[PDB]
Amino acid sequence: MLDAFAKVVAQADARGEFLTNAQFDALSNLVKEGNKRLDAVNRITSNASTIVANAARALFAEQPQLIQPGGNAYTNRRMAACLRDMEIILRYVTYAILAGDSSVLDDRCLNGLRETYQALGTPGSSVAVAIQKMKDAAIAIANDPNGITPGDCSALMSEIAGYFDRAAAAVA
């Protein structure tokens, strides 16, 4: 698991030398916008359950063949597993947001997920659609302008979108 600071340190360790002024400025930019990062992760974590539940209802309304008899989201055991996996993707994306780097997202959660779903038979494209539903929901929840001291946050919202996108593309 690498976070942003750790990522810069690891590159600098590969090249030896000593931390350049540019790298220092980059990390200073990260810390001066840190309060924003923490607020976003707090908002997403606080509504995790409703995000997953709403996205799940939408997925099963849009693609009914999944929950029809004989489909992969049938029999109430596989339904539990599907809800579990949606929540797990959300959890590791939340980890990534707090870290500031997508290394955690690709090192544990997306590490092997593709072949897992390929072997199970679960349609990867549908999982990607579900992740995108969660993407819109979570980004809206975090970008809600009421409830906190106002200020520019669009960069962080785009970063959140980037994490969700990485997961959705890797599953599909």
């Binding site: 579990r84 290394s103 090192d107 544990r108 997306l110 092997g112 997920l113 072949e115 897992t116």
Partner: protein, 282 residues
């Protein structure tokens, strides 16, 4: 080299032994970790968890060793792996889940299989649980972990290769894998054949490279090959799909190519879309 190989972070050991053996929170973690390692990261539903064992577990009447054995011999474990797979494959899974390694030589299968044939499965699990390896690496108070990655114990080099056949990623579970329902390390184990390391998928295209030596070139060139200056590099590939004349045939395969031609061959392979698994000198 951590992320590509798959070992994201397996870099500590979770004991439960404490004055506060429950520790009010740590025991929850230990129970989860045992479920992840013994049941092969299977998604156990809440209703079918082994509540009776956890009762004794917090009480201190049973140690972590007893908890691991209880899960291993409980029908929860049997339904996933024991009943449904070839017996040798079950031996491989036992080695992966209980001793955190892969079979180092055929004698392992001989011994464990004979136990199963005469004494019964319960005795087989018993042998894994109380083998010197389990007693040492783990300690009746330490959840089993994949120590096959680390080489400290003393093991055949092939072991490293072989463990990467069983572990196909952090997300993966042995109930659900590319080559599942059939032996994954059986043909190789009899011939003591090494295996190329298949990296697990990570936000890029994956093509699980099966390596049956029934129809592949030998690991070595076994000749002068083309005879051009330089040795003969063996190039593997999996996802050949574009040029299907009868259907391409043997989509996953290797070609022994002389050094000078490698570049040309490489581009050809890339054109078909197969991602080269390995390029090893022969």
């Amino acid at each position: 080299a951590a992320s590509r190989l798959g070992t994201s972070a397996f870099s500590d050991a979770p004991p439960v032994e404490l004055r506060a053996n429950w520790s009010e929170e740590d025991l929850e973690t230990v129970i989860r970790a045992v479920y992840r390692q013994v049941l092969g990261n299977d998604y156990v539903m809440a209703s079918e968890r082994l509540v009776s064992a956890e009762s004794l577990l917090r009480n201190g009447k049973i140690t972590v060793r007893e908890f691991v054995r209880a899960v291993a011999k409980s029908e929860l474990y049997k339904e996933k792996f024991l009943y449904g797979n070839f017996q040798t494959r079950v031996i491989e899974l036992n080695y992966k889940h209980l001793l955190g390694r892969a079979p180092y030589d055929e004698s392992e299968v001989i011994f464990h299989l004979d136990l199963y044939e005469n004494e019964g499965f319960d005795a087989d699990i018993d042998s894994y649980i109380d083998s010197p390896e389990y007693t040492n690496s783990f300690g009746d108070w330490v959840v089993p972990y994949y120590r096959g990655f680390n080489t400290q114990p003393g093991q055949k080099t092939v072991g490293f290769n072989r463990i990467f056949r069983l572990y196909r990623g952090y997300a993966n579970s042995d109930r659900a894998q590319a080559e599942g329902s059939m032996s994954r390390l059986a043909r190789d184990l009899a011939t003591n054949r090494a295996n190329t390391v298949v990296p697990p998928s990570n936000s890029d295209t994956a093509f699980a490279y099966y390596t049956p030596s029934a129809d592949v070139p030998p690991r070595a060139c076994l000749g002068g090959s083309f005879g051009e200056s330089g040795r003969v590099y063996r190039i593997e590939v999996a996802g050949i799909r574009q040029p299907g004349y009868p259907g391409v045939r043997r989509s996953s395969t290797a070609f022994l190519v002389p050094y000078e031609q490698l570049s040309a061959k490489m581009q050809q392979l890339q054109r078909t879309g197969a991602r080269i698994i390995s390029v090893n000198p022969a």
